[PDB]
Amino acid sequence: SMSYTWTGALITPCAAEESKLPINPLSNSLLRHHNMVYATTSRSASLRQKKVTFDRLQVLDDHYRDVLKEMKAKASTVKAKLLSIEEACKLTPPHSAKSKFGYGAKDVRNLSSRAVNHIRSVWEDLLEDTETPIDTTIMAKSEVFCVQPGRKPARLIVFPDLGVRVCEKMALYDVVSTLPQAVMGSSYGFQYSPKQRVEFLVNTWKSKKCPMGFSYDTRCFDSTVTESDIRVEESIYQCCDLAPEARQAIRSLTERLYIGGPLTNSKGQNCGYRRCRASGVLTTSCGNTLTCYLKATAACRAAKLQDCTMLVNGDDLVVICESAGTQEDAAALRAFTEAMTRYSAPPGDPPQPEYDLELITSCSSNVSVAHDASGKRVYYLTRDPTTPLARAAWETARHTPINSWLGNIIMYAPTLWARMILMTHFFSILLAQEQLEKALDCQIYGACYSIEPLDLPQIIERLHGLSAFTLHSYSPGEINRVASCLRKLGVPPLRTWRHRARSVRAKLLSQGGRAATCGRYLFNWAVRTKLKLTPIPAASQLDLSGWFVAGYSGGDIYHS
């Protein structure tokens, strides 16, 4: 069927949309070519709609069914708990979109009588009505990027009302938080911190006689998800031990929301119908991961690829297997794509066989290689720094809800660019404004987390280890990329940052306390007479468990 059907009503913005990087003194410090940075707006919605709208072709086979059963079998071991209204309410981000029924996230988190009362009726309605399509809002997503030799048309997010969202959590939070791992095991990507992901990719790579890997980019995965895919996804959830009300809720949510439903713009106009995966629901991440995993695993058997290890993060897929030879691999890969195309997962860019782990891009990142104080090779996760930097500038010139830069510093603490540029730039600003103590919100695998800048040293050592503060001698490949990026964006070169870091480090050291700790560990690369960095006491006191359990992008989740 058609992924989408449009009435003609436009995807409207519910507020003024900013698309250009303002000429700000502070942003200008980080990057000079401000005209290269842009934010997508609803003005590009039609370009997207045309890209995501098409008929889906899907032919299933024996391999798909075999793998599906294997998956359900693991699923049968899961026992999911039905969250309470209070629990699910406590998971709602403070900035979440208000309900059109007289309340907002604030009232939800405060267990406001009005909110709760409405959440109850919505739930009661899910238990009674198994058919009525639940309404959803469609908005153009506002994201920041750098221009390219044109521009990316805004992505379209689709999400139901606040009430329904709390209800999703009640019935499915525990499930989407535990089922993926139980089913895919080591292959489930959101369970790993950046360090563990590299570990897994490196060990997996070395477990092959002669490794061959490739990333598989599905063309607009969300609109390639069929009603069949979503029901198959429910059949997997249905294998869990569920409370009676949770089973019905899931059965209803599937038919009324997850498989499709009416689309409404910000003005209340009927935009069209959706027959594919909505981006703004709680099951989006789990569902896509399961679907991507299922199709890929069946495609591997069908394609004759040997000993295929999957690492799946939602629609993002990486595959590592036993090479069978250059020509045999090219053939096998093409066969893999045909199987995937039949499973309704056509490729965007044709996949290419890789024989060098550092050449595979998954989750926009890749495994590189540097050295620690001792001088031994240390693997770590990195990526092209264009977008992170572009967004850093943006978030520097404008008050933005989520600070992707803070999230990038954490996820990419050991990289050349995050340490040399992100930490320097931001700490410098925070110190100049005396905000080193204000906690900031950021995201990790979709979930919102409140973090204090001064705590970064602990978090980094904990997530990455001490080597993140001593890495050096990066690969020529990683260096070239950072170099080109800076050249392209008009970002000051190494020397400029070192001088700035040397200044910040000193200023932080003079403040003592946690700030001094920031200056000693974060900026140890700036000095000649380096300090002897030892494990930070409070690092062992840290509990970053809930940080890397599952993916929640689009799920509207907040881990307090």
Ligand X SMILES: NC(=O)c1cccc(Oc2ccc3c(c2)c(=O)ncn3Cc2c(F)cc(F)cc2F)c1C(F)(F)F
Known binding-site residue numbers for Mg(2+): 217, 315-316
Q: Do the bridges between strand 306-313 and strand 316-322 make them parallel or antiparallel, or are there none, so unpaired?
A: antiparallel
Q: What are the residues binding Mg ion (CB under 5 A)?
A: 191, 548
Pick the closest to residue 171 from 225, 127, 230 (CA basis): 127
Question: Do 539 and 560 meet the contact criterion of CB atoms below 8 Å apart?
Answer: no
Residue 31 binding ligand X, by CB under 6 A: no
Of 213-221, 299-307, 470-478, 531-539, which segment contacts ligand X by CB under 6 A?
470-478
- Which helix (H) or strand (E) segment is 205 a member of? helix 194-206
- Subset of residues 513 to 542 that bind ligand X, contact rule: CB under 6 A: 525
Which of 195, 419, 505, 520 lies at the binding interface for ligand X (CB under 6 A)? 419
Residue 479 binding ligand X, by CB under 6 A: yes
Count of residues of this chain found to bind ligand X when the rule CB under 6 A is applied: 15
Q: How far is the CB of 483 from ligand X (least distance, A)?
A: 4
Q: What is the dihedral of CA 371, 465, 449, 194, to 10 degrees?
A: 50
Q: How far is the CB of 471 from ligand X (least distance, A)?
A: 6
* Distance from C-alpha of 409 to C-alpha of 419, rounded to nearest angstrom: 7
CA distances from 457 to 252, 487, 516 (A): 46, 29, 10
* Distance from C-alpha of 527 to C-alpha of 530, rounded to nearest angstrom: 6
Q: For residue 4, which phi and psi values (nearest 5 degrees)?
A: -140, 160
CA distances from 485 to 227, 481, 490 (A): 42, 6, 8
* Distance from C-alpha of 158 to C-alpha of 274, rounded to nearest angstrom: 9
Pick the closest to residue 28 from 362, 288, 279, 397 (CA basis): 397
Please choose which of Mg ion, ligand X, none residue 548 contacts, taking the beta carbon within 5 to 8 angstroms, the exact cut-off set by kind.
Mg ion
The encoded tokens of residue 351 equal: 């996949």
Q: How far is the CB of 91 from Mg ion (least distance, A)?
A: 19
Residue 483 binding ligand X, by CB under 6 A: yes
Integer-rounded Cα radius of gyration of the chain: 24
Q: How far is the CB of 480 from ligand X (least distance, A)?
A: 8
Q: Tokens 């024989």, residue? A: 355
Of 4-12, 45-53, 233-241, 466-474, which segment contacts ligand X by CB under 6 A?
466-474
Q: How far is the CB of 503 from ligand X (least distance, A)?
A: 14
Binding mask 357-396 for ligand X (x = CB under 6 A): ----------------------------------------
Residue 488 binding ligand X, by CB under 6 A: no
Residue 489 binding ligand X, by CB under 6 A: no
Q: What is the dihedral of CA 217, 186, 294, 316, to 10 degrees?
A: -20
Longest C-alpha distance within the chain, in Å?
70
Based on CB atoms, which residue is closest to ligand X, 72 or 498? 498
CA distances from 350 to 245, 335, 388, 415 (A): 44, 12, 26, 29
Residue 409 binding ligand X, by CB under 6 A: no
Q: Which residues are annotated as a binding site?
A: 217, 315-316
Residue 2 binding ligand X, by CB under 6 A: no
Residue 482 binding ligand X, by CB under 6 A: yes
Q: What is the dihedral of CA 225, 227, 229, 230, to 10 degrees?
A: 100
Residue 474 binding ligand X, by CB under 6 A: yes
Residue 175 binding ligand X, by CB under 6 A: no
Based on CB atoms, which residue is closest to ligand X, 277 or 481? 481
Which of 79, 151, 472, 530 lies at the binding interface for ligand X (CB under 6 A)? 472
Q: How far is the CB of 178 from Mg ion (least distance, A)?
A: 12
The sign of the CA dihedral 308, 314, 315, 318 is negative
Pick the closest to residue 422 from 390, 379, 449, 458 (CA basis): 390
Please choose which of ligand X, Mg ion, none residue 538 contacts, taking the beta carbon within 5 to 8 angstroms, the exact cut-off set by kind.
none
Q: How far is the CB of 497 from ligand X (least distance, A)?
A: 7
Based on CB atoms, which residue is closest to Mg ion, 194 or 280? 194
Q: State which residue has the least CB distance to Mg ion.
A: 548
Q: How far is the CB of 451 from Mg ion (least distance, A)?
A: 18
Per DSSP, 325 falls in state -
Residues that bind ligand X (CB under 6 A): 416, 419-420, 471-474, 479, 482-483, 486, 493-494, 498, 525
